[PDB]
Amino acid sequence: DVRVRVLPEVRGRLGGTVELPCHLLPPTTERVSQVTWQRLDGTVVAAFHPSFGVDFPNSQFSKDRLSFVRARPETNADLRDATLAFRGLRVEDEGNYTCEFATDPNGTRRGVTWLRVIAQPENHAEAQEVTIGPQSVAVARCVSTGGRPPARITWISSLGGEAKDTQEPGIQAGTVTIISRYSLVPVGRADGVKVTCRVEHESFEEPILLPVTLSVRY
Numbered sequence: 471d472v473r474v475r476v477l478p479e480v481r482g483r484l485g486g487t488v489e490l491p492c493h494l495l496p497p498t499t500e501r502v503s504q505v506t507w508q509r510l511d512g513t514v515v516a517a518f519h520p521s522f523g524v525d526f527p528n529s530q531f532s533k534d535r536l537s538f539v540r541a542r543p544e545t546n547a548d549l550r551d552a553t554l555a556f557r558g559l560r561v562e563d564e565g566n567y568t569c570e571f572a573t574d575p576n577g578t579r580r581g582v583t584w585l586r587v588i589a590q591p592e593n594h595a596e597a598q599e600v601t602i603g604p605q606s607v608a609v610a611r612c613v614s615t616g617g618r619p620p621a622r623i624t625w626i627s628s629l630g631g632e633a634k635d636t637q638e639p640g641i642q643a644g645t646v647t648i649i650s651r652y653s654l655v656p657v658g659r660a661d662g663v664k665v666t667c668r669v670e671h672e673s674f675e676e677p678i679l680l681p682v683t684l685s686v687r688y
């Protein structure tokens with residue numbers, strides 16, 4: 471809608487807090503019958519009712535966790551801002567939230583914010599010592615654990631290796647782990663060659679560079 475003002479997407483650290491803005495642009499004279507926030511699955515999260523007052527009907531999104539960012543509404547105008555604050559974000563607070571204003575007698579208007587919960591992963595790379603030999607094996611590995619969304623691992627290498635990585639879910643629901651094994655058939659002129667594991671993830675401004683010096687044996 472035009473009459474309702476929201477952010478198309480919002481981002482908050484897992485366990486952290488977010489504000490979902492919402493306002494009724496056209497500063498008209500028409501009363502706000504009520505305001506309500508619904509997830510797209512149809513779960514009403516928070517609402518200000520006509521004469522009843524402010525409400526938070528679902529168990530999972532209790533009053534202890536959600537609240538309207540502007541809580542002392544004098545007169546209708548005071549209603550034009552339905553900005554909602556989440557504290558203690560869980561993965562399940564993820565969603566497409568619809569901010570809807572009911573106006574009298576018809577009809578209602580509404581905006582949609584995508585609420586995304588982000589989890590910063592833990593990353594590390596180590597070298598695997600290997601003996602020279604005809605089969606390719608993993609000479610180096612990098613692990614990006616507990617990231618949301620999944621991190622992206624690439625490698626910077628002067629050797630002619632294939633990085634083949636695999637994904638498992640992390641210990642935390644919502645989060646995923648990437649294990650990247652860099653393989654090339656261990657030659658000898660690998661030894662001491664600095665190779666970088668590069669992890670990209672939303673929670674970092676720039677890719678993370680993890681240096682590794684390769685070993686080879688005998």
Ligand SMILES: *[C@@H]1O[C@H](CO[C@@H]2O[C@@H](C)[C@@H](O)[C@@H](O)[C@@H]2O)[C@@H](O[C@@H]2O[C@H](CO)[C@@H](O)[C@H](O)[C@H]2NC(C)=O)[C@H](O)[C@H]1NC(C)=O
Nearest residue numbers: 478479509510511563564565566567582583584585586587
């Ligand atoms: C949250 O919504 C965004 C935006 O998408 C709109 O409404 C959705 C319900 C759906 O109908 C989309 O087609 C609409 O664009 C979603 O972002 C899209 O995600 C889809 C997978 O459903 C993906 O293929 C598209 O590339 C995304 N669209 C755009 C324009 O980037 C997102 O998936 C929704 N998230 C959740 C958890 O529901």
